[PDB]
Symmetry: C5
Subunit: 237 residues, 5 copies
Amino acid sequence: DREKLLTESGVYGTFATFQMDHDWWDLPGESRVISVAEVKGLVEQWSGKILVESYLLRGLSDHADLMFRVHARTLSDTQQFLSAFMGTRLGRHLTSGGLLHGVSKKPTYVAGFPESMKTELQVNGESGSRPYAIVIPIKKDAEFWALDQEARTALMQEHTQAALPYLKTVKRKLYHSTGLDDVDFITYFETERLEDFHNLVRALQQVKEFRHNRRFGHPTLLGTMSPLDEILEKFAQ
Amino acid sequence: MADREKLLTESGVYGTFATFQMDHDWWDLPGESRVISVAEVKGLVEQWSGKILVESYLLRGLSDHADLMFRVHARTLSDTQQFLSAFMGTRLGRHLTSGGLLHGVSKKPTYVAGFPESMKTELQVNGESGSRPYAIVIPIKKDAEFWALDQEARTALMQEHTQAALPYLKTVKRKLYHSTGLDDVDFITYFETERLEDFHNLVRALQQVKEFRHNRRFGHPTLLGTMSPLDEILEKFAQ
Amino acid sequence: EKLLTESGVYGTFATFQMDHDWWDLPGESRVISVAEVKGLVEQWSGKILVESYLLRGLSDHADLMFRVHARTLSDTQQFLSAFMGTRLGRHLTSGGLLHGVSKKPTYVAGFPESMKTELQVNGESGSRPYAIVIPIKKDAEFWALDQEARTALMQEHTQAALPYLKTVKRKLYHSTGLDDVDFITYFETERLEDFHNLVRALQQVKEFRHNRRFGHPTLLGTMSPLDEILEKFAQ
Amino acid sequence: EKLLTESGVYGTFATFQMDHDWWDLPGESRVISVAEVKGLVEQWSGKILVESYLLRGLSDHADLMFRVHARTLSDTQQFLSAFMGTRLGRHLTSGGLLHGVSKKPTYVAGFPESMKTELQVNGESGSRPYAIVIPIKKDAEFWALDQEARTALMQEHTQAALPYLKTVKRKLYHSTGLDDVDFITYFETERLEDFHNLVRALQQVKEFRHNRRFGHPTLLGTMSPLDEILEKFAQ
Amino acid sequence: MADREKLLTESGVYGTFATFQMDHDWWDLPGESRVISVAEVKGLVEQWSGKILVESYLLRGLSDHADLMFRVHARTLSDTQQFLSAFMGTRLGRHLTSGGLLHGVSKKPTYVAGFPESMKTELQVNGESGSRPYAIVIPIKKDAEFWALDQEARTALMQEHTQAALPYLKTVKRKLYHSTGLDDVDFITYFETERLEDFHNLVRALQQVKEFRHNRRFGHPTLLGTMSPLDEILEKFAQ
Ligand code: HEM
Ligand code: HEM
Ligand code: HEM
Ligand code: HEM
Ligand code: HEM
Ligand SMILES: [C-]#N
Ligand SMILES: [C-]#N
Ligand SMILES: [C-]#N
Ligand SMILES: [C-]#N
Ligand SMILES: [C-]#N
């Protein structure tokens, strides 16, 4: 039910990044192929309860080789899966990178937008395989929360407005992360055109809302989306 | 039989949050050797069950760079020190990197007396009846501004704080430790909940009151975990 | 070169540091590993451009840097993932990693016609020049400004730098959204004291105070062919 | 004794953490290592004073702390380099390291005569008391004030602390120029709840807002003879 | 015999500060093997005795996370690069974790000319005649404001700076390297002294002038060490 998890509300989303130790290559090739096999099996073992997608950060994001985007209706399940993964022979040679959670929620400000804008917001992304993926954690300043509903709705309409020209070439998803870690939002983007995504962020950097981002990125995780087998394959030969 | 509940609720009781992370080499130990290690620890906690209260949380896979957390109640910190030092001594403890470590006294309320009587009434309910609830720990440091204020001013801020939280008194258990002078934070807040989505909302609500902007440090780290008996946690390290 | 001057070309800066246990390897093993990499680079020399810098002894916690030009970052990813896969790469701790596309000038058009002319000069005729890389993040104020305001700030920026237009080669990469910086600046020079003066000069204009992040890290190295660098790793 | 109260006596705070690979050592080798250190300390007990604190289980990433007094830092350097040279010292990752000279009072003379009187009492009747160490750095503003202004700030500081003069011993080291802090504060007490109140009290005076750095780390430990501390690592 | 001092006093001479920390595995080497390693380095330095000047400082036990520091003078940084790369290559170097690394040009005074003639006279004095003095290194970054100032304003600030420091020209040797553009600081300051208490007072004095508040970065790290010949430092790593 990928359909259900990727779009519904109440679905927790977790982003876990990992980096491979050096002593992993001190292991003989044989030991490594077995290790890869263990993990692929574990992920397949969980495919019933949760969704797991893989990203190659190696060579695009500093100090990170692999990232999982995990959807689940409870974080407990996500915990059980991640603790197991980190337990495997492969997991034991991975230094845990960033770990961020956030629930997907129903839109809060879109209702107060022009009806013509709601129409355009119907489109989310393109039809693409092995797209780039970008993840940007966000913390708002105290000011942002002090604002009243009308004020923020105005800021968001300005945010949305600037982004409309990229509505097709950049898929987007927003996770509400407050209280589960040190950020207010987790933003997630898929795109085949990074030059568009770059322009999309400069455009958003010029709206008013932007200056309220006490934390913007750190880390800004850039990677290529790919099946788990092809990623681990690189660590076996 | 045993008034264990006193430590968990009484005032003057020091409360300590110690996190640990497991080394990679812990699995170089044979599966059997690891299960023996669990028993060593389980016994040690039981040996101390007279002097202190110890509760366990699985942080692995929810909190970055942390696998295990203990919430230790004790009427003096030397005792907590001895136990934690002993724990780190067990075979298992020898393969644990000490993570964050925070202390704080639980005290009788300072501002609640100046609230409306209807508010004092509602604050009697603390949490739900739940087993294996999520647990959250958020360290907090107030800015210099906050301390410069007078009692009346602060009493007003906290009354606003309480009001914002009222819709969540049931679905979120709470406890506050006074941590100033024992480390680099002023308070240690601790919460149990079965619905994190509520807790998320509880925090968005508090983010919008006045008091909030006086938190020079809020979280960093924000420790999220599952509450569970010590056996089941250590069991996981024996696969 | 097509990649070095045209727009739309991604530029990537990847830093590496050599592990201690690398020298525990026997002399033979070290030289064979060197050969593996040299081959990998030529293997990619068709799809991408790769240049090397010895940071060892000039930049802290860094021995080596690659500047990789490519029309897609996927290629750069594949190459870097491969490089770190070689026996040599397996003894390298990934240092800093930054990407940025080369873009068509945004403010130069609004400059005086005499200034546009002078900007045609970029650098000197030099081999094995020093190289410097300085990442930059602008503050929120800077983006809020209007085109005229920014066009003005940059014109003052350009003005301060004109006396160094000859002795300092320059290139600017637009890095926003691919990492935690807005620009990646890259400079080649034979005279660092000139480059030092160029930066002290720029520190005094208005624009400068809008650089929320300036350096961190400031990567200083000598430019050199890949062979000569790895050779030091063949002792 | 001699050193703990006179001026011109440098005081050094050194923290250490025991590595994991220490428990891979056989039990005997560890006791021999323990014996080594105990000897080195007694060997130096003539020239300098050294005291021990068990931070293990009270301060994160710290097991042991030394408070070393000496009339010159040269001596303290020699001792600390030697200590870290010992078999045990080789299994300790150095934590924080801070220096500060003990100096004669600067602001106390301008206080009320009744206040000078009360400050004569310093501490309690305690054995194996808790110890707290808090580094402090003042902001630029604090130094900009004139002597009269600061003297007022200190008098408000002193006033707030008077109720705790008996249950809390204090010592102040002047650390500017020997590291990245201006002051190192050190306190012994049997009641932490008192010390807690002492710090909550002082947080409310005016002076406090001038502390650009407060703690980081705030080292909490129990004071104990070196023998009983090392004993735990010989099991 | 050797005009070594060309580097220590001339302008246009790059000065580089490199710190190192000794790995744990260095003591796995047999005693004899370590002494040979010392000889290798002593030789490498003497091999370079033509092109550069190298001085050594023992940071072990005075500076956090650092054992050894080199102050290297060279007319080009490439030479310093090659030397440091060779040094880091030696048997000894292979067991050293590279700490901080900072470069800076020695330049002729910019503000001293605009001072009173009585002040220029006093500034002729630099330091004392002392052996094995303490050494301090403080990296510095000025804020944007400082550069926005005009020459006259900065000259005033520096004259106030100089004035505050006049009482210490005897007990504290000083040197200033202009570091902007070679790393993340604008200046590298270097001091030798037999009396740290004097150096301490010197810094409180400078903390009270106007100029000081423009130091966006001050120290971090503040490197304190004892100056000594390379052999006696390395000698300590052989026992
Ligand atoms: C085509 C691109 C984008 C579109 C259409 C878009 C639109 C929106 C909309 C409509 C909302 C609020 C809707 C609601 O909660 O009811 C929102 C929220 C948000 N967006 Fe975007 N956005 C885009 C790109 C981006 C980018 C590139 C970032 C980069 C950081 C970003 C960061 C955020 C954050 C942090 C929020 C949370 C604000 C809040 O709800 O309080 N968005 N976006
Ligand atoms: C159901 C949820 C909550 C309720 C009913 C509640 C209520 C209260 C009350 C009545 C006090 C004053 C008690 C006293 O010290 O006399 C207080 C203090 C405090 N609360 Fe909460 N609160 C809730 C949630 C939270 C959360 C979610 C946080 C932070 C993440 C938080 C942080 C604090 C802090 C730092 C204080 C100490 C203020 C001080 O004594 O100076 N509280 N709370
Ligand atoms: C001889 C030396 C230099 C010259 C001639 C020069 C000239 C220019 C020019 C003409 C532009 C406008 C680009 C455009 O219109 O898109 C520019 C942009 C820029 N320069 Fe330089 N520059 C020099 C050195 C430097 C240095 C040393 C730094 C930083 C350490 C730097 C940082 C930047 C940045 C961050 C931008 C992009 C600003 C923006 O597009 O918003 N430049 N430079
Ligand atoms: C019983 C408790 C305390 C007493 C009686 C006390 C009293 C004093 C007095 C009289 C001075 C001025 C010394 C002089 O004239 O040179 C002073 C200095 C200082 N105290 Fe305290 N204090 C106490 C606790 C604390 C605590 C708990 C802290 C920090 C958490 C602290 C931080 C400082 C600092 C940073 C200075 C140096 C100020 C300066 O010289 O510029 N003190 N103290
Ligand atoms: C006896 C001690 C000292 C004396 C006589 C002294 C004197 C001077 C003088 C005359 C200058 C002007 C140099 C020029 O024209 O370029 C200067 C520059 C400078 N001094 Fe000192 N100083 C002393 C100590 C210190 C200390 C202890 C520090 C920092 C911890 C320091 C930081 C600086 C810096 C950063 C500059 C460069 C400012 C600029 O060129 O914009 N000085 N000093
Ligand atoms: C915005 N997603
Ligand atoms: C609120 N504890
Ligand atoms: C300037 N590039
Ligand atoms: C106050 N020492
Ligand atoms: C002034 N050095």
